[PDB]
């Protein structure tokens, strides 16, 4: 089945090395690449880096590449398994690695091969990638997702004082996915004009995901800007707001520091309950319909308490790290009601699909997501359609490691033709469509 | 030969619509997309936009898409021409349009099809794209180019006061193209730390091409910054500097305004002679080996004078717009000694290859180039290798519409194996290899 597997080091969207894998079958070349996070949860499967400080500041991935070329590849070719057998090939890699967190080969090594196998498998089935993924997941009724565009940035890697990481727009009232793209781009260009006028001509360069990071401190002010741009573009009822707080990043001694990029001062810290009250005010004052990582990745009681007292979507990211073990705990404690799905948090296509089905079985939403460090790879566009989740976040409508996914979703919608359905206001629960 | 052509609107790396074309033959699907400039020369072929303010603020390209789908596609199909016949298919489109600047269909309509045809032709020849391009151009040897990374930004679309558009680094002393990527990436990341420390944490977000635009006014300070990053990264011996001044953008009244982003004040203006004197100082104080568009696209006398008084590379971009007619004039007046090759400035692959050959036959260097607005398309990576020009500028090593090209060049290098030659110090004049 598999003629050759060959891995190489390429550069991701931030200029850092990452893994790319070529898989050859009689049907051709199938290529995939691995993303890389910046604000990673402490429970993520292992991203294997070389640590050679004289090459790429220690960020090379030659070791992961070698694990693929020297060990994984001959093992999978020796097995004789068909590339359609995703689960068997993935399980084979998992047992070969033999560690829970994939720390022998690296999650980035195993995922690279896993993605390529999946693409080669689709071609063997003579199916577009999204339909093959749907079949692997047991789905038949595909849907185009609502895109969630990160347009204002704060948090650990933004050069402002804004503590919360992401402020997103979601065109839930769009007519189609192609129309959602147009709405997103128009609000984005509107927002750029607003920021230029108010914060100056030098305030509209972009961050890693293509959004803006103007110098503000109040999170409420970020929500004000976004709502202002939505209204100015004429889409007040059609576009709503999502947030990724990434609260693990400013968790201090059991409390939360909404000014953590300023010199340390413990008296400013607030409690989980105070943080929960602040969110309730956001949901009251602004059309916020989704909040991701509202509390620290270990602060389970605060998650459960908040989720039980709000009607919006509550997304586990660093809390759940696409990990069935952590998800089951979150399900049992009712910590959240949506899973953020990051294939490189867990390290294989099979396990990511299992994590998605576990969420969906329990009435949760699922939002497919990029990493801050992306590539020209568009796998997650087919993934979100095949898993039928109804929602994807994969950047502002700016920088092609983000537009490559959005463009692919527009091609998919086009291909599905008259059968294309758009999640719209049912992005949390698209199965009712 | 051509079974079907289908065009669609996608978004480019700036979030604006552009043309993508799917072309089908017996051997499969061949896809290409068109870039879009920000500081466009007045002599470029016409980029056709819709101007419908109800959509994308008038930036849609539905008309171009419709010209392809309704007019160009059935014409090329009815012609029965093989996809290997690049020249004939391109000429067919040129005649169909019947205007000098492709203003009936739009240059973007025509190029999109032209690029897809070229990819379909390579597969028909059972060749990698760059070898097909090599044959179309009459070349036999292939060479990997020195990359020119735009790391510091000024000019029309930078939010600082810096007038000159691009300050680039060229790893002429790298061992190979893969090593050139590493040198570029390490200097880029070094520079980011330098900019952070001197100008602040809020000063390292990126512009359209992945580079930085800190708040500086003196162009000499830009050159100092770059030099400082090169040495701190430890590569003083191996990396030199290129500039794209884009002087057309600040040509005022026959004079030049090095503060054109401040409110108009003619007392500020300097003459071409004075500008030329400033370049002479740059070339002396810094390792500047290449200057692009030093004078206005119509200021021929200033070009000829300057070029005759220096030994560095002098690059026509807006001067020449990849246009054989304007190049012949430049040749005659010895206005410059290098052509910046932008396929969408002239609108077809055949005409771009002709522009390149006309340049090379007259002893000029050729630097293949991106546009500010790019896509996930990687055609120019194969183009620069097939045309053997020895140099390419396709962005900072940041943002995957940039890295897609650089990554593709690393794959090409790998594929050529033992036969891979890197232009290195012969980037201006590679045919001696
Ligand atoms: O937490 C994050 C960061 P990361 O780089 O994936 O950690 C960006 C992404 O949108 N998300 O949810
Ligand atoms: O003048 C330019 C700009 P443009 O967007 O192509 O006009 C960016 C490119 O590097 N170049 O030479
Ligand atoms: Mg994170
Ligand atoms: Mg997150
Ligand atoms: Mg220009
Ligand atoms: Mg230029």
Burial of residue A177 (CB within 10 Å: 0-12, 13-18, 19+) is buried
Burial B203-242 (b: 16+ CB within 10 A, else e): bbbbbbbbbbbbebeebeebbebbbebbeebebeebbbbb
**Main-chain dihedrals φ then ψ at residue A23, nearest 5 degrees:** -120, 125
Same domain, A232 and A340: yes
Which residue in chain A has the smallest CA separation from B7? Answer: A411
Task: Give the ligand at the shortest distance from the Cα of A369.
Answer: 1
**Alpha-carbon gap, residue B365 to B360, rounded angstroms:** 6
Residue with tokens 């990374």: B149
- The answer, yes or no, to whether any atom of ligand 2 lies below 6 A from the CB of B248, is no
The answer to whether residues B243 and B149 touch, using CB atoms and an 8 Å cutoff, is no
Token output for B113: 């099809």
Q: Comparing C-alpha atoms, which of B397, B253, B309 is closest to residue A373? A: B397
**Alpha-carbon gap, residue B327 to B362, rounded angstroms:** 10
Q: Residue A28, SS3?
A: strand
* DSSP assignments along A66-135, one per residue: HHIIIIIHHHHHHH---TT-HHHHHHHHHHHH--TT-TTT-HHHHHHHHHHHHHHHHHHTT--HHHHHHH
Residue with tokens 């489109």: B93
Token output for A262: 């300023």
| Strand-pair partners of B33 | B20
User: How far away, in angstroms, is A293 Cα from ligand 4 center?
Assistant: 7
Residue A326 C-alpha, separation from nearest chain B C-alpha, in angstroms:
33
- The answer, yes or no, to whether any atom of ligand 1 lies below 6 A from the CB of A47, is no
Same domain, B236 and B119: no
Number of domains in chain B: 2
- The answer, yes or no, to whether any atom of ligand 2 lies below 6 A from the CB of B244, is yes
Token output for A301: 């009681």
Token output for A194: 């607003």
Residue nearest to atom 9 of ligand 2 (CA): B371
Q: How far is CA A92 from CA A88, A121, B117, B269, in A?
A: 6, 16, 42, 70
* DSSP assignments along B295-345, one per residue: S-TT-HHHHHHHHTT--SEEEESTTTTT-HHHHHHHHHHT--SEEEE-HHH
Please say whether the dihedral angle defined by the alpha carbons of residues B74, B80, B84 and B86, taken in this order, is positive or negative.
negative
Cβ atoms < 10 Å from Cβ of B320:
33
Residue with tokens 């290798």: B385
> CATH number, domain at A173?
3.20.20.120
The answer to whether residues A319 and A41 touch, using CB atoms and an 8 Å cutoff, is yes
Active site residue B261: no
Burial B392-406 (b: 16+ CB within 10 A, else e): bbbbbbbbbbbbbbb
Reading across the β-sheet that carries A17-25, which strands appear in turn?
A: A4-11, A17-25, A28-33
**Alpha-carbon gap, residue A383 to A352, rounded angstroms:** 10
> CATH number, domain at B22?
3.30.390.10
Q: How many CB pairs under 8 A join A and B?
A: 127
- Of the candidates B126, B145, B172, which is a domain's last residue? B126
Residue with tokens 């007619």: B325
Q: Residue B201, SS3?
A: helix
Q: Comparing C-alpha atoms, which of B392, B397, B388 is closest to residue B419? A: B388
**Alpha-carbon gap, residue B372 to B166, rounded angstroms:** 11
**Alpha-carbon gap, residue A171 to A248, rounded angstroms:** 28
Cβ atoms < 10 Å from Cβ of A63:
16
Same domain, B110 and B153: no
**Alpha-carbon gap, residue B254 to B257, rounded angstroms:** 10
Beta strand B166-170 with B240-244 is antiparallel
Task: Give the ligand at the shortest distance from the Cα of B370.
Answer: 2
Q: Residue B277, SS3?
A: helix
Same domain, A197 and A346: yes
- Containing A315, the helix (H) or strand (E) segment is strand A313-316
Chain mean position to CA A368: 5
Q: How far is CA B97 from CA A10, B49, B105, B133, B381, in A?
A: 41, 16, 6, 24, 28
Q: Comparing C-alpha atoms, which of A403, A328, A399, A339 is closest to residue A369? A: A339
- Phi/psi region, residue B395 (left: phi>0; alpha: psi -120 to 50; beta: rest), is left
A182 interface with B at CB cutoff 8 Å:
yes
Residue nearest to atom 1 of ligand 1 (CA): A39
Q: What is the signed CA dihedral for A124, A129, A130, A134, rounded to 10 degrees?
A: 30
- Of the candidates A64, A93, A126, which is a domain's last residue? A126
**Alpha-carbon gap, residue A189 to B405, rounded angstroms:** 26
DSSP B264: P
Residues in CB range of B31: below 8 A, 6 or more apart: B20, B21, B22, B23, B116, B119
Residue A92, CB-side half-sphere exposure with 13 Å CA sphere: 21
Residues in CB range of B230: below 8 A, 6 or more apart: B169, B187, B236, B239
Same domain, B225 and B266: yes
Residue nearest to atom 1 of ligand 2 (CA): B39
DSSP B270: B
* Minimum-distance ligand 1 atom for the alpha carbon of A36: 5
Same domain, B16 and B98: yes
Residue nearest to atom 2 of ligand 1 (CA): A39
Q: How far is CA B417 from CA A20, A228, B66, B176, in A?
A: 18, 55, 43, 11
- Of the candidates A107, A126, A145, which is a domain's last residue? A126
**Alpha-carbon gap, residue B240 to B427, rounded angstroms:** 12
Token output for A5: 């597997």
Same domain, A109 and A120: yes
Beta strand A17-25 with A4-11 is antiparallel
**Main-chain dihedrals φ then ψ at residue A369, nearest 5 degrees:** -145, 150
Residues in CB range of B234: below 8 A, 6 or more apart: none
Burial of residue A77 (CB within 10 Å: 0-12, 13-18, 19+) is middle
Q: How far is CA A49 from CA A66, A299, A369, in A?
A: 12, 29, 22
Q: What angle do CA A227, A229, A231 make, to 5 degrees?
A: 70
Cβ atoms < 10 Å from Cβ of A333:
13
User: How far away, in angstroms, is B259 Cα from ligand 5 center?
Assistant: 18
Same domain, A373 and A250: yes
Same domain, B150 and B230: yes
Token output for A424: 């719209």
Which residues have a beta carbon within 5 Å of ligand 4, which is an ion?
A: A 244, 317
**Residue B213: its chain A contacts at CB < 8 A?**
202, 205
Helices and strands of chain B, counted as H and E runs? 14, 14
**Main-chain dihedrals φ then ψ at residue A339, nearest 5 degrees:** -105, 130
Interface with B, mutate which of A4, A7, A14, A195 (most B CBs under 10 A): A14
The answer to whether residues B399 and A401 touch, using CB atoms and an 8 Å cutoff, is yes
Query: Would you tell me the crossing angle of helices B177-199 and B400-416 to the nearest 10 degrees?
Result: 150
**Alpha-carbon gap, residue B150 to B169, rounded angstroms:** 7
**Alpha-carbon gap, residue A364 to A401, rounded angstroms:** 28
State the binding site of B: 39, 157, 166, 244, 292, 317, 369-372, 393
The answer to whether residues B290 and B365 touch, using CB atoms and an 8 Å cutoff, is no
Chain mean position to CA B320: 13
Residue B19 C-alpha, separation from nearest chain A C-alpha, in angstroms:
12
| Strand-pair partners of A31 | A22
Resolution (Å units)? 2.0
Q: How far is CA A401 from CA B375, B405, B409, in A?
A: 9, 12, 18
Same domain, B121 and B241: no
Helices and strands of chain A, counted as H and E runs? 14, 14
Q: Which residues of A are catalytic?
A: 209, 342
Q: What angle do CA B105, B73, B408 make, to 5 degrees?
A: 85
Helix residue ranges per DSSP H, B98-173: 107-124, 129-137
B271 interface with A at CB cutoff 8 Å:
no
Same domain, B89 and B143: no
**Technique behind this structure?**
X-ray
Note down the domain range covering B420.
127-433
- The answer, yes or no, to whether any atom of ligand 2 lies below 6 A from the CB of B38, is yes
Same domain, A161 and A111: no
Q: For chain A, how are helix, strand and coil distributed in percent, rounded to 5?
A: 45, 15, 40
């Amino acid at each position: 089945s598999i003629e050759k597997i060959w891995a190489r080091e390429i550069l991701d969207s931030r200029g850092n090395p990452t893994v790319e894998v070529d898989l050859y079958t009689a049907k051709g070349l199938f290529r995939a690449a691995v993303p890389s996070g910046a604000s990673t949860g402490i429970y993520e499967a292992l991203e294997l880096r070389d640590g050679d400080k004289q090459r790429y500041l220690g960020k090379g991935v030659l070791k992961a590449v070698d694990h693929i070329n020297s060990t994984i590849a001959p093992a999978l070719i020796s097995s004789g398994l068909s590339v359609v057998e995703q689960e068997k090939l993935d399980n084979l890699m998992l047992e070969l690695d033999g560690t829970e967190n994939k720390s022998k080969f690296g999650a980035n090594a195993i995922l690279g091969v896993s993605l390529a196998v999946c693409k080669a498998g689709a071609a063997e089935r003579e199916l577009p990638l999204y339909r093959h993924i749907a079949q692997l997941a047991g789905n038949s009724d595909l849907i185009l997702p609502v895109p969630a565009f990160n347009v204002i940035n704060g948090g650990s890697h933004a050069g402002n004082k804004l503590a919360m990481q992401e402020f997103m727009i979601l065109p839930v009232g769009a007519e189609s996915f192609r129309d959602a793209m147009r709405l997103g781009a128009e609000v984005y260009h509107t927002l750029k004009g607003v920021i230029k006028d108010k914060y100056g001509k030098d305030a509209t360069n972009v961050g890693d995901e293509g959004g803006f990071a103007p110098n503000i401190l109040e999170n409420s002010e970020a929500l004000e800007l976004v709502k202002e741009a939505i209204d100015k573009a004429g889409y007040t009822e059609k576009i709503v707001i999502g947030m990724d707080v990434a609260a693990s990043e400013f968790y201090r001694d059991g409390k939360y520091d909404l000014d953590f990029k300023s010199p340390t001062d413990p008296s400013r810290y607030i409690t989980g309950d105070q943080l929960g009250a602040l969110y309730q005010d956001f949901v009251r004052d602004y059309p916020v319909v989704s909040i991701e990582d509202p509390f620290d990745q270990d602060d389970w009681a605060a998650w459960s308490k908040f989720t039980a007292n709000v009607g919006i979507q509550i997304v586990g990211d660093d809390l759940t790290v696409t990990n069935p073990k952590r998800i089951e705990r979150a399900v049992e404690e009712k910590a959240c009601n949506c899973l953020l799905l990051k294939v490189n948090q867990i390290g294989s296509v099979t396990e990511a699909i299992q994590a998605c089905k576990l969420a969906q079985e329990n009435g949760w939403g699922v939002m497919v997501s990029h990493r801050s460090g992306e590539t020209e790879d568009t796998f997650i566009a087919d993934l979100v359609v095949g898993l039928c989740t109804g929602q994807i976040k994969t950047g502002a409508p700016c920088r092609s490691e983000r537009l490559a996914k959005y463009n692919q979703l527009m091609r998919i919608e086009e291909e599905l033709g008259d059968e294309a359905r758009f999640a719209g206001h049912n992005f949390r629960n698209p199965s009712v469509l």
